[PDB]
Amino acid sequence: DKIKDAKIIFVVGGPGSGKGTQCEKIVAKYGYTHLSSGDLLRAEVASGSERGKQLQAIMQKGELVPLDTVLDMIKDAMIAKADVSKGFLIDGYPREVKQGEEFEKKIGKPCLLLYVDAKAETMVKRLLKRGETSGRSDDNEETIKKRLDLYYKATEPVIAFYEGRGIVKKVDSELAVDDVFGQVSKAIDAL
Ligand SMILES: Nc1ncnc2c1ncn2[C@@H]1O[C@H](COP(=O)(O)OP(=O)(O)OP(=O)(O)OP(=O)(O)OP(=O)(O)OC[C@H]2O[C@@H](n3cnc4c(N)ncnc43)[C@H](O)[C@@H]2O)[C@@H](O)[C@H]1O
Ligand SMILES: [Mg+2]
Structure with a gap:
């Protein structure tokens, strides 16, 4: 239960808003464990697995993959690092209110x-600029x-949800x- 007592930071924002960019800076400065839902999903694609092919099709359409699939990937990754992590940076999850609620039920x-x-x-x-060169379809x-x-x-309702919770810090x-x-x-230093 190292995890449920662990420092968990959600990072939420639109496609291309700069989540990953900011998370890489957080890692370099604060040393948190960066778990990107997109990166975990693309890793499953890269494995050549049949699951990977199914996820690839969903992501190519711009649609949300099933909740259990991404939450379970994130949970497994957190457990693998629970003994050594300085804190968890969850990037791109949650993306719907139910994803936040299930995360709190199953993890912390x-x-x-x-x-x-x-x-x-x-x-x-x-x-569009990134798409000039990226491997993203x-x-x-x-x-x-x-x-x-x-x-x-x-x-966006996820943002509203955690505003009601009282833990949102907006960055421009x-x-x-x-x-x-x-x-x-500023936000992390105030933790
Ligand atoms: N201040 C600044 N000034 C100037 N330039 C700046 C800048 N900040 C950044 N930039 C530049 O802007 C560009 C973007 O920056 P970057 O930092 O890469 O932006 P980003 O917010 O991380 O956007 P991404 O498009 O990489 O991720 P995503 O929102 O589509 O989510 P994900 O991969 O998880 O999702 C992919 C797919 O996976 C599926 N999926 C992912 N997560 C879930 C989930 N929880 N549930 C269900 N499905 C999911 C979905 O199909 C999803 O669509 C860069 O060129 C950067 O250099
Ligand atoms: Mg990203």
Whole structure:
């Protein structure tokens, strides 16, 4: 039960808002264990498994993969690091209110949610630029629009939920990367 007593930080924001970017800075500075739902899912794809093929199809459409699948991947990763971790940074989960609730039922309660806030047009620009070079098949304009629609519909209520909980710190991800990280640092330092 090292885990349920562990420091757990949720990182929530739209596609291309800068979640991963900020999380890499957090890792370098604070040394937290970075668990990205996207990275865990893409790792399953990379394994060549039949599960991986199914997840790949879902992610290519810009849709949410089943709750149990991603939560179980995250839980397993947390357990594998429970003895050595300085704290957990959960990046890209939860993306619906039910994902937050099941995480609290099966794992533990977050002490902080970092709301990486960016405008829709900013996210589109960022993702199209990244899509010029990235290995992501979902960085195309049509799928980008689907990802955004899902974000506002399903994931923004997550932000509202943890605002009601009282643990959200909003960071302005339209500033320069280091400037955003200053706000991130402020929030983490106050823990
Ligand atoms: N919980 C879940 N449940 C069900 N399904 C799930 C799930 N999680 C994932 N899935 C499935 O997996 C798919 C992929 O999800 P996932 O990969 O987890 O989420 P994502 O939001 O699509 O991730 P991105 O990498 O696109 O965005 P990011 O916010 O991390 O931005 P980044 O820092 O890279 O930055 C983006 C660009 O902007 C640049 N940038 C960042 N910040 C700045 C800044 N301040 N100024 C200028 N440029 C910046 C960056 O250099 C970069 O080029 C989902 O669509 C879904 O299908
Ligand atoms: Mg990311």
